[PDB]
Symmetry: C2
Subunit: 1011 residues, 2 copies
C-alpha cells in the first residue's frame, strides 16, 4: 500500500488523541501525581537493525529477532548511534520535491522489543501502547500480527493491543521510515534525523473509562471569583450508577468539588451526549497563575459509582488564568503582557533530538535566571513533560503545530491545497486535544513557514471554535493574515522597513498603525543570535516599553544545534552542517543560540538578561526611582545594593530593601556621597538582589542592574617633569630612541614601530601596524559562499574593495628631537589597484618618563565600504596569565551590544578574553576602556580592544574552533573605533547606520608604557 507516500493516510487503527492519562486506581496517588501501576514505561534496551529501504526488511523479522541486530537504548535517533548520517539543511528539502513521493532508498529502522505482560492486564480492561515520538512514519506489529500505522513525528500515536497480547512474553516489531509524505510537512530548519526518539509506554484502562476531559476557568471582572468547568467524556457501557466527581485541591486542602451522573444538556434536535457530563465548581478568590507566580491547583477526575466505588481517576494541574485580546492588547488576567521570550528547539549535542528531564529543567532555570518569561515551541509540539514543567516553574508557552513546508515553491503550494487539509488538520487538532489543559500554553500556533493557504484559515477557525480561551497566531504569508490574532513577524526591524513584495516586513512601530490595523504585535522570531550577535537588541526593548501594542517577541534562538563528533584521539568537538558528510547542507546556520549546545552561555545571553529586566531605574540628584514591570507580584524577594566608585575604586556602598507594588514605583534617597580627592569619574552602580532562593534561582541571585556617571573631576595637574631625556639614533633603515633600559625602533622602510626593548628584551613578534578589517562574523558573511557569493554581504563588499588585500604605502617617516622628548611622524596610504582606501597619519612622542604617546588620524574614502574597524594591532612576545582593565566588562561587548556591560576594574585569565564561538571570527572585544594592563605593558586612553593567542588571520581562515592553535606570544587589537556586529537577521546587512564607521575622518590617541 505504500501508506508513507499518501497524504490521505496519516494513520491506521490509531486511537483518538487526548490529554495525559495515567489511569490511577487510587484517588490519592492521582492527587499527589505519584506513579501509577497502570502506566508502564517500555524505555530501555531494544533490538535495532538498519535497512536501506522497507523492501529490504526480511519477513522473519516479524516473527523473531534478527541475530545481526544490535542492542540499543530507546528513545533515540539512530543517527546518534552512527547507523547513518544526520542531515542539516535549512529551507531546501532533504529529498527531491515530488509530493507525495519519497526516495525509493528510504532508510528504515527496525526496532523490536521482547517484554512481559501480566495476566491481570489481559483478564480485563484495555491495554494500549503509546509512542510519544517516532520520526517520521511507522508500521507496528505485535507478536507477528500487524497492529497499525502512524505519522506526525511530534505527537503520540496510540494503539489498542488488548487483542494482540498474551500472558507473559510478547514481542513488538516497529518498522520506522525516515521519509514519508509526512516529511513534506516537517521541513523545519534543523537536523533531519529519525527513529523512536520519545518515550514508549503501556497504559491500562478499564473497559468503562474516562476517554477525555477538558478543563476551563472563567472569571468575573475583578477575578475575585471563578468557575472551573470540567467536561468529562467516557467510553464503554453507560449506566445510571455511573458518576463523575471533579475535585480541586490546594496542597492537601480540598477547595471545591462537584458530582453528577452522565448525561449532558440538550444540544440539538436529537438530544445531547449521554456519554458526557460537565461539572462546574465555584472558586472564590482563586490564586491566579502567571509566569510571575505559577499558582497551581490539582484537579482530580473520578469515574465512580453512585455508591462511591472508584473505577478510575485521571488528573491535571490547573492554573487559574484568563488569556484574551482586548482593544489591541494581549491580556493575562486583565493585564497587558510583555513577552520576554525565546524560541527553543528540542536539541541535545549527544542525544540529538531526544529530550530528558534534566536538560529541560536546566533550560528552564537558565531562561528564568536570565529574565525570560516565555518560550515558543519552534516548530512542533514538545515532549509532554515540557508543558508540565512550564506550568510549575512558570513560563508562557506558544504551542505550535508540526507543520512547515518552507521548501515548497511558492511556500503555500501544499497549505493552500485542499488535498493536504486532512494531513494538516491532524497536526493541529491532535495538538490541541493533547495540550489544552495546560495553563502554561497561552497561545496556539498553526505552524511555521508554510506561506498562507486556505487550509490555515480553516484550521484557525477550528481552534477558535473548540477552544476560545486562547488566541491563535501564525506568521506565514505576511505575518498579519486572516489566520492570526497577533501580528507576529519574524525579523521585522524596529525603525527600518523591508518592503519585500507580497510579504513585507514593516518596521514594527509602523506595522501597528497601518490603515485599519488594531492587533497586538509580538515577534515570533527576532534578534538572530548566530555567533557574535545580538547587536541592536536594546533598540527592540526600548520600543517594546514605549509602545503598548508592541508586546515583545521570541529571540531566535535558545541553543546552538551543534553536534558532538570525536577526533582520532577520541577528543570531542562541536560539529555543524556538512561535518557528517551530509550534502547538500547549510553549514553554520544550525547554530543560532544564546547558549552553546552544552548550555554554556554565549556573551549575548547577558545582554538579553539586562534588557529583559523587570525593574527600571532613573536617577535624579540623590534619588533613585525604581519602577516595577511586574504585573502581579510585589517585590517581596528583592533588595537593592548600591555602590559608588572612582575609576574602579569603591568609595561608598549600601543596600535598601525593595518594596514596589506591581507596576509601582519606589523612591530611594542615597546618603550624602563624599567628594573624592583624586581626579577621575565617579560611577554609581545599582543591582537588585534576591536574598532568598527560589525554585529557579539561588540565594543572592542578581536579577537587574544599572549604572550612571556621577560627578567627574578633570585632571589639571601636570606630571612631574623628568630630568631624563630620550636620545635619538639614526641609520638608513631605522630611527631608534633610547631612554634608560628602554628602546624603541622605527623601521624607516615600513614606517612602523617594528620593535621595542625593556632591558634589552624584545617586546614584539610582529610590528605595530594599522588594521581596518576583522575576521568576519556570521552577520558579516550572511549567506555568501565561495561558490555562491552574495555581493551585498559586508564581507563581500570589504573583499571586493580590497580591504583585506590593501598594502600599506609609506608616504612619510620623519624624526625630530624636541626639548624633552623625541617625536616620530609617519603617514601611510592603503591602496588597492590604484585606489587609496585609507590614509593614516601618526605621531609618536616618547618623553623622559619613558611614556610613548601615539596620535592617530585616519581618512576613509567616502566611496569605499565603511571599515570593520579603525585601530592598531601587533603580536606581543609576552604571554601573561591575567588581563586587567578599566572599562566595560567583564564579558565581551561591542558598540551595539554593550548596555549589559558595566564600567569598572576587571581582571580575568587570558583565556576568558576569547569567546569560543564554534565558527571562529572576531571576538572578545571590550569597549570603553580607559586603561589596559597585560604583563609589563599598560595602555591608556579611550579605546576598544581584544587580546588573545589567535590572530585575526587565523580566525578568518579557520572553520571550527577546535582547529585553532595558540600562536606565539599574544595578539593585541586596540581600536579607536569598531563597527557594530548587528543581528536583526543573519542573511542581509543588519548593522544600523549609527554603528557604521562612516564619519570619513577618525581620531584617537594611545599612551603605551611600562606598568
Amino acid at each position: 500500500r505504500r501508506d508513507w507516500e499518501n497524504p490521505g493516510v496519516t494513520q491506521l487503527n490509531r486511537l483518538a488523541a487526548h490529554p495525559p492519562f495515567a489511569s490511577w486506581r487510587n484517588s490519592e496517588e492521582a492527587r499527589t501525581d505519584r506513579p501509577s501501576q497502570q502506566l508502564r514505561s517500555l524505555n530501555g534496551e531494544w533490538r535495532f537493525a538498519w535497512f536501506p529501504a522497507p523492501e529490504a526488511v526480511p519477513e522473519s523479522w516479524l516473527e523473531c529477532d534478527l541475530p545481526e541486530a544490535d542492542t540499543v537504548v530507546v528513545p533515540s535517533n539512530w543517527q546518534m548511534h552512527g547507523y547513518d548520517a544526520p542531515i542539516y539543511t535549512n529551507v531546501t528539502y532533504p529529498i527531491t520535491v515530488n509530493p507525495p513521493f519519497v526516495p525509493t532508498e528510504n532508510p528504515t529502522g527496525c526496532y523490536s522489543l521482547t517484554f512481559n505482560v501480566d495476566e491481570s492486564w489481559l483478564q480485563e480492561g484495555q491495554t494500549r501502547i503509546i509512542f510519544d515520538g517516532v520520526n517520521s512514519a511507522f508500521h507496528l506489529w505485535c507478536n507477528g500480527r500487524w497492529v497499525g500505522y502512524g505519522q506526525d513525528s511530534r505527537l503520540p500515536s496510540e494503539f489498542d493491543l488488548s487483542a494482540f497480547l498474551r500472558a507473559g512474553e510478547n514481542r513488538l516489531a516497529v518498522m520506522v521510515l525516515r521519509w514519508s509524505d509526512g516529511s513534506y510537512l516537517e521541513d523545519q530548519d534543523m537536523w533531519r534525523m529519525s527513529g523512536i526518539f520519545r518515550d514508549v509506554s503501556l497504559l491500562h484502562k478499564p473497559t468503562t473509562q474516562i476517554s477525555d476531559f477538558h478543563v476551563a476557568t472563567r472569571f468575573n471582572d475583578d477575578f475575585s471569583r471563578a468557575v472551573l468547568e470540567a467536561e468529562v467524556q467516557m467510553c464503554g457501557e453507560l449506566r445510571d450508577y455511573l458518576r463523575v466527581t471533579v475535585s480541586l485541591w490546594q496542597g492537601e486542602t480540598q477547595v471545591a468539588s462537584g458530582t453528577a451522573p452522565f448525561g449532558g444538556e440538550i444540544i440539538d434536535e436529537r438530544g445531547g451526549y449521554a456519554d458526557r457530563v460537565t461539572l462546574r465548581l465555584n472558586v472564590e478568590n482563586p490564586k491566579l497563575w502567571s509566569a510571575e507566580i505559577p499558582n497551581l491547583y490539582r484537579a482530580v477526575v473520578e469515574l465512580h459509582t453512585a455508591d462511591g466505588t472508584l473505577i478510575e481517576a485521571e488528573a491535571c494541574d490547573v492554573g487559574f488564568r484568563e488569556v484574551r485580546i482586548e482593544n489591541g492588547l494581549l491580556l493575562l488576567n486583565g493585564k497587558p503582557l510583555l513577552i520576554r521570550g525565546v524560541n527553543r528547539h528540542e536539541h541535545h549535542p549527544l542525544h540529538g533530538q531526544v529530550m530528558d528531564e534534566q536538560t529541560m529543567v536546566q533550560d528552564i532555570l537558565l531562561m528564568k535566571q536570565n529574565n525570560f518569561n516565555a518560550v515558543r515551541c519552534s516548530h512542533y509540539p514538545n515532549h509532554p513533560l515540557w508543558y508540565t514543567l512550564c506550568d510549575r516553574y512558570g513560563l508562557y508557552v506558544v504551542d505550535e503545530a508540526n507543520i512547515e513546508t518552507h521548501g515548497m515553491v511558492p511556500m503555500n503550494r501544499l497549505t493552500d491545497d485542499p488535498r493536504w487539509l486532512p494531513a494538516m488538520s491532524e497536526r493541529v487538532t491532535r495538538m490541541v486535544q493533547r495540550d489544552r489543559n495546560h495553563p502554561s500554553v497561552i497561545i496556539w500556533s498553526l505552524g511555521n513557514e508554510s506561506g498562507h493557504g486556505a487550509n490555515h484559515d480553516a484550521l484557525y477557525r477550528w481552534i477558535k471554535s473548540v477552544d476560545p480561551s486562547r488566541p491563535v497566531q501564525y506568521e506565514g504569508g505576511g505575518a498579519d493574515t486572516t489566520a492570526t490574532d497577533i501580528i507576529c513577524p519574524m525579523y521585522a526591524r524596529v525603525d527600518e522597513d523591508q518592503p519585500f513584495p507580497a510579504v513585507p516586513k514593516w518596521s514594527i512601530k509602523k506595522w501597528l498603525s497601518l490603515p485599519g490595523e488594531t492587533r497586538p504585535l509580538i515577534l515570533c522570531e527576532y534578534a538572530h543570535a548566530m555567533g557574535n550577535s545580538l547587536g541592536g537588541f536594546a533598540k527592540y526593548w526600548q520600543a517594546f516599553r514605549q509602545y503598548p501594542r508592541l508586546q515583545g517577541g521570541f529571540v531566535w534562538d535558545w541553543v546552538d544545534q551543534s553536534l558532538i563528533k570525536y577526533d582520532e584521539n577520541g577528543n570531542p568537538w562541536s560539529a555543524y552542517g556538512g561535518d557528517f558528510g551530509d550534502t547538500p547542507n547549510d553549514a553554520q546556520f544550525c547554530m543560532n543560540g544564546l547558549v552553546f549546545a552544552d548550555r554554556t552561555p554565549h556573551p549575548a545571553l547577558t545582554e538579553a538578561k539586562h534588557q529583559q529586566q523587570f525593574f527600571q531605574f532613573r536617577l535624579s540628584g540623590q534619588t533613585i526611582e525604581v519602577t516595577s514591570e511586574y504585573l502581579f507580584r510585589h517585590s517581596d524577594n528583592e533588595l537593592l545594593h548600591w555602590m559608588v566608585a572612582l575609576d574602579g575604586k569603591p568609595l561608598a556602598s549600601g543596600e535598601v530593601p525593595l518594596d514596589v507594588a506591581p507596576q509601582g514605583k519606589q523612591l530611594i534617597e542615597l546618603p550624602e556621597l563624599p567628594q573624592p580627592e583624586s581626579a577621575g569619574q565617579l560611577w554609581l552602580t545599582v543591582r537588585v538582589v534576591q536574598p532568598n532562593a527560589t525554585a529557579w534561582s539561588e540565594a543572592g541571585h542578581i536579577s537587574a542592574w544599572q549604572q550612571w556617571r556621577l560627578a567627574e573631576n578633570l585632571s589639571v595637574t601636570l606630571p612631574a617633569a623628568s630630568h631624563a631625556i630620550p636620545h635619538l639614533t639614526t641609520s638608513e633603515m631605522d630611527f631608534c630612541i633610547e631612554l634608560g633600559n628602554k628602546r624603541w625602533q622605527f623601521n624607516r622602510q615600513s614606517g612602523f614601530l617594528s620593535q621595542m626593548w625593556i632591558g634589552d628584551k624584545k617586546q614584539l613578534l610582529t610590528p605595530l601596524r594599522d588594521q581596518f578589517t576583522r575576521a568576519p562574523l556570521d552577520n558579516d558573511i550572511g549567506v555568501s559562499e565561495a561558490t555562491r557569493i552574495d555581493p551585498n554581504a559586508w564581507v563581500e563588499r570589504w573583499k571586493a574593495a580590497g580591504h583585506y588585500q590593501a598594502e600599506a604605502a609609506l608616504l612619510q617617516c620623519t624624526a625630530d628631537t624636541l626639548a624633552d622628548a623625541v617625536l616620530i611622524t609617519t603617514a601611510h596610504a592603503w591602496q588597492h589597484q590604484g585606489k587609496t582606501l585609507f590614509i593614516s597619519r601618526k605621531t609618536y612622542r616618547i618623553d623622559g618618563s619613558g611614556q610613548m604617546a601615539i596620535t592617530v588620524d585616519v581618512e576613509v574614502a567616502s566611496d569605499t565600504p565603511h571599515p570593520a574597524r579603525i585601530g592598531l594591532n601587533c603580536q606581543l612576545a609576552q604571554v601573561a596569565e591575567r588581563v586587567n582593565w578599566l572599562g566595560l566588562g567583564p564579558q565581551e561587548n561591542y558598540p551595539d551590544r554593550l548596555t549589559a556591560a558595566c564600567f569598572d576594574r576587571w581582571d580575568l585569565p587570558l583565556s576568558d578574553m576569547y569567546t569560543p564561538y564554534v565558527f571562529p571570527s572576531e571576538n572578545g572585544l571590550r569597549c570603553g576602556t580607559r586603561e589596559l594592563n597585560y604583563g609589563p605593558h599598560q595602555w591608556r586612553g579611550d579605546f576598544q580592544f581584544n587580546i588573545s593567542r589567535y590572530s585575526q588571520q587565523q580566525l578568518m581562515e579557520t572553520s571550527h574552533r577546535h582547529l585553532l592553535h595558540a600562536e606565539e606570544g599574544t595578539w593585541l587589537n586596540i581600536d579607536g573605533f569598531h563597527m557594530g556586529i548587528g543581528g536583526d537577521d543573519s542573511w542581509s546587512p543588519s548593522v544600523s547606520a549609527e554603528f557604521q564607521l562612516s564619519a570619513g575622518r577618525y581620531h584617537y590617541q594611545l599612551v603605551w608604557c611600562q606598568k
Copy 2:
C-alpha cells in the same frame, strides 16, 4: 559657569623641527574650583607659512553639554566678500542643514548675518572645508559664522536695530556646534544626537594667507 569660565594656562612650550616650529598649549576652564573643559592644542608653522592648529577638548561629563566647541577671534580686516566651500548659501545648523548644498559660495559679508529681531548666535554655515576672507584662508572640516557682531554684543542686545558694527570682523570657527532645536520654544528641544555629549572632541585647522 560656562559664560563666566576663565582660561587657566596649564602648559605652553615651543620646539624647532627640521622644517617647522611647534607650539604646544594646554588650558583648563574652571568655575568655582570645577574644571569644565580642558583644551590641548599644537600649532605647527612650516616653510610655506601655513599654520596647522590641532585641538583636543575634554568636557566634564557632569557639566551641561556645551553650545559649541571651537575658536574665535576678532580680525582687524573688514572685507566685502566671504567665499567658502561648504554647505550653503544660506545659514544652516547641524539639525537644520538638509536644504543646504555643498558647493563654492561667495556672498557679501552682510549676508553672513541673519537679522533676527531678537539677536542671538546666527549665520553659521556647516560642513565647510575651506573659508576665504580678505587675505585669510582656513582649511579643514568645520562650521563657522563671520560678522561685525561679537557673541557678547549679540547676547547683550534685545533688538537688532540696537546692534552696532564693531571694529574689524568677528570670526567663530567651530569643530562642533550644538543643534538649535525647535520642536517647541519653552522646553529643551535639541535632540540627543545633536547635543555635544561625546566627552572628548578633536578638530584641526590650517590657517594661511590666500
